[PDB]
DNA sequence: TCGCGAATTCGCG
DNA sequence: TCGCGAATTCGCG
């Protein structure tokens, strides 16, 4: 990055800014970097917007809505930039989900499970809900060439390295990262087609098979692989990175503004 | 359909065959209709299969697996047909999910909610998990031109018509189908791009925008709109319909078998 | 064994 | 108000 965002990142760290809060800080860092462009933060998108976006592509799409006031509310929020035609182009969506209380259970003393006897709780499947907002915003962005969706993981269910947690009574309980009674990371990798976890997959990829050539929209799935809490500074720099990439993809529709104002 | 499947459907009804069980009955009805083709029922697909399918399309795909023995287990199962090159082409995947106990609560007497006072329970978001298996099998079928995924809904959270349920003490509690404290149908419509609920969306649609032309894989979302339980016969005929369509799309790779054996 | 699936109650603004 | 989001325990084979 550049120097100015090193200042913003320390501010995030100094305050432990939550994902929505860091998302706002990113909107602020960008409007500080591109003073001639207009940025906006939004905390929800209602299904009518999505449908109207869908119909603009093919008139058989976006045709259903049972609850009128139905909406999508990513807990990190949406950031958008206004292009050269008055349209609002999304540059960042972010989420931060949690699963697996194990490490806190065996840092102090608590045996869990059906009869208070297990060291580990067998992980559940709740984190699968994240695929909805991904297909909602992917449909919303079905006519774009980028997809700035950032999902942050935290908890014992998303480890990528073996960690050992010592009980109060000294007993060192040991978490093996590839244990399919804890690790639920594989429940997410359909969202980016098995491409690299912990990387920037913002620019859309076009594959083929027959008379095809088709676009893939891949979520950026970042995990805190060791079980610790996310560092607000890193969270910032990643979101700023995904953002700037979105801007590079949007360049053609941003020229006249940046070059005149 | 034809006459023979009217017999099979009554058999399903006579026994209240669950979705996996009806899926088996469909595999049996098809091999009874196409005696020269080989069909197979499967009750899971493990992530290695999916990844290997992904890599066959683009070598950057399918690259992650944290738990080796990780798998996908749709509660309806997978049916496949063997094509002219020894490959197994999936013709049916089915699921049947449930949400919303309301109607049974107010058929007999039970006030729910935080202090045992509410007639309705405010619906939760668990049904969003279904988007994972949809993106798993869609990636699995990323090189196909059809997508035979059938999701069946049941419960108070998926109504499409206003129903009134009389309490034991005569009091007629009234369920309004578009109430966004009950209806969670809108949580599913990202899976078929707002195309018609309760229809056969098996054959893949190709839209565009710029230098594009891209394929859409749309789930077939069937709801029992009035709150009742599914009729096993209907479940059968729908799954048989989706199946036969899959076969029409696979025709070119099935010719030599059907025309010789 | 190891792993996938069930859906639930309710806080929030 | 109406509606979206939190993730959890544990059965199963």
Q: Please state, in angstroms and rounded to a whole number, the distance separating the CA atoms of residues B162 and B207.
A: 35
Chain A hits for B180, CB-CB cut-off 8 Å, are 67-70
Q: Please state, in angstroms and rounded to a whole number, the distance separating the CA atoms of residues A166 and A170.
A: 6
Kindly give the pairing relationship between strand A45-46 and strand B45-46: unpaired
Q: Please state, in angstroms and rounded to a whole number, the distance separating the CA atoms of residues B230 and B232.
A: 6
Count, residues in chain A: 261
Helix axes B47-55, B130-140, angle to 10 degrees: 40
Q: Please state, in angstroms and rounded to a whole number, the distance separating the CA atoms of residues B121 and B182.
A: 8
Instruction: Give the distance, in angstroms, between residue A13 CA and nucleotide D10 C1'.
Output: 38
Answer whether any strand D atom is within 7 A of the Cβ of A64.
Answer: no
Chain B hits for A142, CB-CB cut-off 8 Å, are 207, 209
DSSP B128: G
Q: Please state, in angstroms and rounded to a whole number, the distance separating the CA atoms of residues A174 and A110.
A: 15
Helix axes A19-33, A4-15, angle to 10 degrees: 160
Answer whether any strand D atom is within 7 A of the Cβ of B70.
Answer: no
Residue B200 burial (CB count, 10 A): 15
- In CATH terms, A1-261 corresponds, of 2.60.40.420, 3.40.50.720, 3.40.580.10, 2.60.120.260, to 3.40.580.10
Q: Where are the domains of chain A?
A: 1-261
Q: What separation in angstroms does the CA of A203 have from each of A29, B174, B231?
A: 21, 49, 46
Resolution (A): 2.5
Say if residues A243 and A26 touch (Cβ distance below 8 Å).
yes
Can you say whether residue B130 is alpha, beta or left, with left for phi > 0 and alpha for psi between -120 and 50 degrees? alpha
Instruction: Determine which one of B33, B75, B226, B231 is catalytic.
Output: B75
Say if residues B58 and B116 touch (Cβ distance below 8 Å).
no
Say if residues A212 and B214 touch (Cβ distance below 8 Å).
no
Say if residues B153 and B238 touch (Cβ distance below 8 Å).
no
Chain B hits for A183, CB-CB cut-off 8 Å, are 66-67
- Would residue B97 show up in a list of annotated catalytic residues for this protein? yes
Kindly report which amino acid residue has its CA closest to the C1' atom of nucleotide D10: A114
Select from A69, A70, A132 the Cβ nearest to the Cβ of B128: A132
Say if residues A257 and A36 touch (Cβ distance below 8 Å).
yes
Q: What separation in angstroms does the CA of B97 have from each of A128, B41, B154?
A: 15, 20, 7
DSSP B15-40: HT--HHHHHHHHHHHHHHH-TTS-EE
Residue B54 CB contacts under 8 Å (≥ 6 apart), including other chains: A193, A194, B61, B62, B139, B142
Answer whether any strand C atom is within 7 A of the Cβ of B98.
Answer: yes
Longest alpha-carbon distance in chain A: 69
Per residue, the 3-state secondary structure of chain A, as one string, reads CCCHHHHHHHHHHHHCCCHHHHHHHHHHHHHHHCCCCCEEEECCEEHHHHHHHHHCCCCCCCCCCCCCCCEECCCCCEEEEECCCCCEEEEEEEEEEECCCHHHHCCCCCCECCCCCECCCCCCCHHHHHHHHHHHHHHHCCCCCECCEEEEEECHHHCCCCEEEECCCCCEEEECCCCCCCCCHHHCHHHCCCCCCCCCCCECEEECCCCCCEEECCCEEEECCCCCCCCHHHHHHHHHHHHHHHHHHCHHHCHHHHCCC
- Would residue B161 show up in a list of annotated catalytic residues for this protein? no
Answer whether any strand C atom is within 7 A of the Cβ of A207.
Answer: no
Q: How far off is chain B from A134, nearest CA to CA, in Å?
A: 9
Structure tokens at B196: 């018609």
Structure tokens at A200: 């920037």
Strand partners, B81: B39, B89
How far from each other are the two terminal CA atoms of chain B, in whole angstroms? Answer: 24
- Would residue B186 show up in a list of annotated catalytic residues for this protein? no
Q: Please state, in angstroms and rounded to a whole number, the distance separating the CA atoms of residues A233 and A11.
A: 8
Q: Please state, in angstroms and rounded to a whole number, the distance separating the CA atoms of residues A257 and A39.
A: 13
Residue B254 CB contacts under 8 Å (≥ 6 apart), including other chains: B37, B81, B83, B84, B247
Say if residues B78 and B95 touch (Cβ distance below 8 Å).
no
Method of elucidation: X-ray
Strand D and chain A: which residues 187-216 have CB closer than 7 Å? none
Residue A235 burial (CB count, 10 A): 28
Instruction: Determine which one of B80, B83, B95, B102 is catalytic.
Output: B95
Select from A57, A128, A180 the Cβ nearest to the Cβ of B209: A57
Q: Please state, in angstroms and rounded to a whole number, the distance separating the CA atoms of residues A203 and A156.
A: 30
Kindly give the pairing relationship between strand B214-216 and strand B205-207: antiparallel
Helix (H) / strand (E) element for B82: namely strand B78-82
DSSP B160: S
Q: Please state, in angstroms and rounded to a whole number, the distance separating the CA atoms of residues B73 and B67.
A: 15
Q: Please state, in angstroms and rounded to a whole number, the distance separating the CA atoms of residues B148 and B79.
A: 10
Of A29, A57, A255, A233, which Cα lies nearest the Cα of A142? A57
């Amino acid at each position: 990055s550049q120097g100015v965002i090193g200042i913003f990142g320390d501010y995030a760290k100094a305050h432990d800014l939550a994902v929505g809060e860091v998302s706002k800080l990113v909107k602020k860092a960008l409007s500080n970097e591109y003073p001639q462009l207009s940025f906006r933060y939004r905390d929800s998108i209602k299904k009518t917007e999505i449908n109207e976006a869908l119909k603009k592509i093919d008139p058989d799409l976006g045709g259903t809505l049972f609850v009128s006031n139905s909406s999508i509310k990513p807990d990190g929020g949406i950031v958008e930039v206004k292009d050269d035609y008055g349209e609002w182009r999304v540059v960042l969506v972010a989420e931060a989900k949690h699963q697996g209380k194990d490490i806190i259970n065996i840092r102090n003393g608590l045996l869990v499970g059906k009869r208070g006897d297990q060291d580990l709780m067998a992980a559940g499947n709740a984190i699968e809900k994240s695929h909805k907002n991904i297909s909602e915003i992917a449909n919303f962005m079905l006519s774009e060439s980028h997809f700035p969706y950032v999902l942050f993981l935290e908890g014992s269910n998303f480890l990528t390295e073996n960690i050992s947690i010592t009980r109060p009574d000294g007993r060192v309980v040991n978490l093996e990262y590839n244990s399919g009674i804890l690790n639920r990371l594989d429940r997410l990798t359909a969202a980016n087609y098995g491409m690299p976890i912990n990387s920037n997959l913002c620019i859309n990829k076009f594959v083929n098979h027959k008379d095809k050539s088709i676009m893939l929209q891949a979520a950026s799935i970042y995990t805190q692989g060791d079980g610790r809490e996310w560092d607000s500074k890193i969270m910032f720099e990643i979101m700023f990175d995904i953002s700037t990439t979105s801007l590079r993809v949007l360049g053609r529709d941003l020229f006249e503004q940046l070059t005149s104002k």
